[PDB]
Design an enzyme around this catalytic site. Structure first.
Site, PDB file in Angstrom:
ATOM      1  N   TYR A 290      -2.729   8.116  10.174  1.00 41.22           N
ATOM      2  CA  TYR A 290      -1.518   7.323  10.468  1.00 41.22           C
ATOM      3  C   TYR A 290      -0.851   7.877  11.720  1.00 41.22           C
ATOM      4  O   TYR A 290       0.335   7.526  11.955  1.00 41.22           O
ATOM      5  CB  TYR A 290      -0.556   7.273   9.268  1.00 41.22           C
ATOM      6  CG  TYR A 290      -0.938   6.324   8.155  1.00 41.22           C
ATOM      7  CD1 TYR A 290      -2.237   5.866   8.009  1.00 41.22           C
ATOM      8  CD2 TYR A 290      -0.022   5.949   7.186  1.00 41.22           C
ATOM      9  CE1 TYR A 290      -2.597   5.024   6.968  1.00 41.22           C
ATOM     10  CE2 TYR A 290      -0.368   5.090   6.149  1.00 41.22           C
ATOM     11  CZ  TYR A 290      -1.662   4.634   6.026  1.00 41.22           C
ATOM     12  OH  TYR A 290      -2.015   3.758   5.029  1.00 41.22           O
ATOM     13  N   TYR A 507       2.318  -5.327   5.564  1.00 36.92           N
ATOM     14  CA  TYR A 507       1.541  -4.089   5.611  1.00 36.92           C
ATOM     15  C   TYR A 507       0.059  -4.436   5.796  1.00 36.92           C
ATOM     16  O   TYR A 507      -0.455  -5.361   5.131  1.00 36.92           O
ATOM     17  CB  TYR A 507       1.734  -3.251   4.357  1.00 36.92           C
ATOM     18  CG  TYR A 507       1.363  -1.805   4.562  1.00 36.92           C
ATOM     19  CD1 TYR A 507       1.899  -1.103   5.628  1.00 36.92           C
ATOM     20  CD2 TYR A 507       0.485  -1.137   3.727  1.00 36.92           C
ATOM     21  CE1 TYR A 507       1.629   0.240   5.830  1.00 36.92           C
ATOM     22  CE2 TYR A 507       0.237   0.221   3.894  1.00 36.92           C
ATOM     23  CZ  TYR A 507       0.775   0.902   4.970  1.00 36.92           C
ATOM     24  OH  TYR A 507       0.564   2.240   5.183  1.00 36.92           O
TER      25      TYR A 507
END
Ligand SMILES: *[C@@H]1O[C@H](CO)[C@@H](O)[C@H](O)[C@H]1NC(C)=O
Ligand code: NA
Length: 663
Positions: A290, A507
């Site tokens: 991430y 998302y």
């Protein structure tokens, strides 16, 4: 065998198979199938040749509903023949799409409505009814709540039919969305493949599964979408032992794509457009997921953060040199200044930095942390505060360098925590000049909608299209997905609302600029399962969107809704070009003098696109012969592959031609 009803519904009859209603004196399979279709509850039926009977759930034959799309699929257009319907004595006509539902908040649900006509009539007698749903099984009529306050989705479902009052949309004001494009894997991450004379392919990837992830796996499912021809294929990339879910992504000087960490948190893969193959890079000095990476002015790639995978701690900077083919750890590139404050703690706080390569090998970090920082790679690395953007963190906000020449960054939306967090409407223009000197931040008009997990792209005219996101960040949900796109115009510091897309993109969605100056919006969902190969059958499939849709912006349309005449770049050398050199190209099909802008090819995942940027150009014209002096600063004109767009004075862009900027 496959029977197709007069409206387009499909049933598959398999002679010799067995597995609410039992009708006798049925002579065949087709008859039972026609019985199945009469019944809104029927997905599977059994024909009995022996007793000549049809059971709505060898001696038997099975009937199965088998439409091109499965039950529960999101749609952008009626899968079946539509009908019109005018309520007697009303002068108000409705479109009816059979075997479909509108999901979302209802203004009203009324029991004892027994016909589609009575449901349309109720819609006609209800103030502000634009969408209604007839429930064939329960004899009920739902009036949907008003859009865009509420998000209403269109789903394939035999139990229901939908009723709508068509909205007139002026594409010259609101753009136009195309229909859903079905894809083999959820496009959780995507990139344009560099190619001459213009790119034609989007690669996209999920994880070890087409709709699921775990941890380390050593494999990534890829799709390959040729948006020129519509051809789509898939492959399983295993040769780099890399599950590329949740990675950093940057485009190198030579147009190779560096895919860093994620599920295999210390693994690096390099995509080579010349071979269509992946090679192992050197392992990162720190395992990460991430994180954001950015290509620098010198072709090196900086990254910081990435607590999602590897050790669950803050991650200092490191830098990749593609010439040495080495990673160097940068402990002086301290993660602490760039942390958000997250209710889920350090796991989240160093994720998805808003990173931009800038002058003299500098890095600008624009967010999502309240405070902005300069990072650098000299000695063991450097960090300093640059400015305060906002009074809260904007995790997974959107951010884009819309004017590299003037050091202009636009950012909007995001949420103070990664998830379970109301999203902001706040937006800002950040202006950078000399690295390691103060940045300037101007708050601009709020977005019309709060958006967590939205996506953004810069267009040739310097406007920024924000797509999708949801009112409250809620990982792996459709909940309150905004369908209305917004266009921000930095010249006026104004927003405009665009046409709505069909599918919420929250998302694990993406957006990316295509070479015809349209925007691909796609993905969303994925299911977590503990182990590689576990069953996904327990997964909520309603949040997975293995598809995309392409937006045509207003600049592609004349005032009458016809497609505006695009400039044509008729001739341009395929040779690479250096900063400060003069690009020349032939332009045909323009009334008056075109403008030109370069837009760096995009890569995108998790609301992060660290490869795109707009570099506006000044041109001079001798007849149909255009010339532009490229910026001489590689901090502005990052190396690698660009779209060249020539636009009419009214702002209509050409199909792009590829330009390769080299060191
Ligand atoms: C990556 O390379 C480093 C250095 O050899 C090694 O020590 C590490 O275990 C490797 N890790 C993986 C995950 O391949
Ligand atoms: Na927070």
């Amino acid at each position: 065998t496959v029977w197709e009803t007069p409206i387009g519904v499909k049933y598959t009859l398999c002679p010799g198979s067995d597995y609410l209603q039992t009708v006798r004196d049925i002579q065949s399979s087709l008859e039972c199938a026609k019985i199945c279709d009469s019944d809104a509850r029927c997905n599977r039926a059994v024909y009995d040749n022996v007793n000549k009977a049809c059971d709505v759930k060898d001696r038997f034959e099975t009937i199965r509903l088998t439409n091109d799309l499965p039950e529960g699929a999101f749609i952008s257009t009626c899968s079946f023949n539509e009908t019109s319907y005018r309520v007697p004595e009303t002068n108000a006509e409705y479109r009816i799409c059979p075997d479909t539902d509108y999901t979302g908040v209802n203004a009203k649900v009324v029991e004892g409505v027994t016909t589609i006509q009575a449901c349309a009539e109720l819609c006609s007698n209800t103030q502000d009814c634009r969408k209604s749903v007839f429930d064939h099984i329960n004899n009920a009529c739902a009036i949907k709540a008003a859009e865009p306050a509420t998000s209403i989705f269109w789903v394939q479902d035999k139990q229901f039919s939908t009723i709508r009052l068509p909205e007139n949309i002026d594409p010259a004001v609101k753009g136009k969305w195309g229909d859903l494009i079905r894809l083999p894997v959820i496009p959780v991450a995507a990139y344009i493949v560099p190619s001459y004379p213009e790119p034609s392919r989007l690669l996209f990837f999920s994880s070890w599964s087409n709709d699921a992830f775990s941890g380390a796996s050593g494999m990534t499912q890829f799709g390959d979408y040729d948006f020129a021809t519509g051809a789509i294929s898939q492959r399983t990339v295993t040769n780099t032992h890399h599950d590329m879910f949740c990675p950093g992504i940057s485009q190198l000087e030579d147009g190779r794509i560096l895919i860093q960490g994620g599920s295999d948190a210390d693994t690096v893969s390099i995509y080579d457009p010349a071979t269509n193959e992946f090679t192992r890079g050197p392992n990162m000095t720190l395992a990460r997921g991430y994180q954001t990476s950015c290509t620098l002015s010198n072709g090196k790639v900086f990254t910081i953060g990435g607590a999602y995978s590897g050790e669950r701690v803050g991650k200092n900077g490191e830098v990749y040199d593609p010439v040495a083919n080495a990673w160097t750890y940068l402990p002086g590139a301290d993660f602490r200044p760039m942390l958000t404050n997250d209710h889920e703690g350090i796991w989240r706080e160093d994720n998805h930095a808003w990173l931009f390569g800038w002058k003299n090998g500098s890095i600008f970090q624009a967010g999502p942390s309240k405070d902005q920082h300069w990072y650098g790679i000299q000695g063991n690395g450097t960090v300093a505060k640059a400015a305060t953007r906002d009074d809260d963190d904007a995790m997974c906000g959107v951010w884009v360098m819309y004017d590299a020449v003037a050091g202009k960054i636009f950012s909007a939306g995001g949420s103070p925590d990664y998830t379970d967090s109301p999203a902001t409407q706040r937006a800002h223009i950040t202006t950078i000049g000399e690295p390691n000197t103060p940045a300037e931040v101007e708050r601009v008009a709020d977005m019309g909608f709060p958006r967590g997990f939205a996506n953004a792209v810069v267009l040739p005219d310097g406007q920024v299209l924000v797509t999708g996101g949801q009112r409250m960040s809620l990982v792996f949900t459709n909940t309150d997905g905004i369908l209305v796109a917004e266009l921000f115009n930095p010249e006026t510091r104004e927003w405009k609302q665009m046409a709505p897309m069909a599918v919420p993109r929250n998302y694990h969605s993406v957006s990316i600029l295509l070479p015809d100056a349209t925007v691909f919006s796609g993905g969303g969902g994925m299911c977590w399962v503990q182990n590689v190969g576990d069953s996904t059958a327990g997964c909520d499939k309603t949040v997975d969107h293995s598809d995309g849709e392409i937006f045509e912006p207003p600049y592609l349309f004349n005032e009458d809704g016809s497609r505006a005449a695009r400039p044509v770049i008729s001739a341009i050398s395929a040779d690479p070009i250096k900063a400060g050199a003069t690009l020349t190209f032939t332009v045909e099909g323009v009334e008056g003098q075109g403008t030109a802008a370069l837009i760096r090819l995009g890569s995108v995942t998790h609301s992060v696109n660290s490869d795109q940027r707009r570099v506006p150009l000044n041109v001079t014209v001798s007849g149909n012969e255009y010339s532009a002096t490229l910026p001489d600063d590689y901090g502005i004109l990052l190396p690698g592959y660009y779209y060249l767009f020539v636009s009419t004075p009214q702002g209509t862009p050409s199909i792009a031609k590829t330009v390769h900027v080299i060191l």
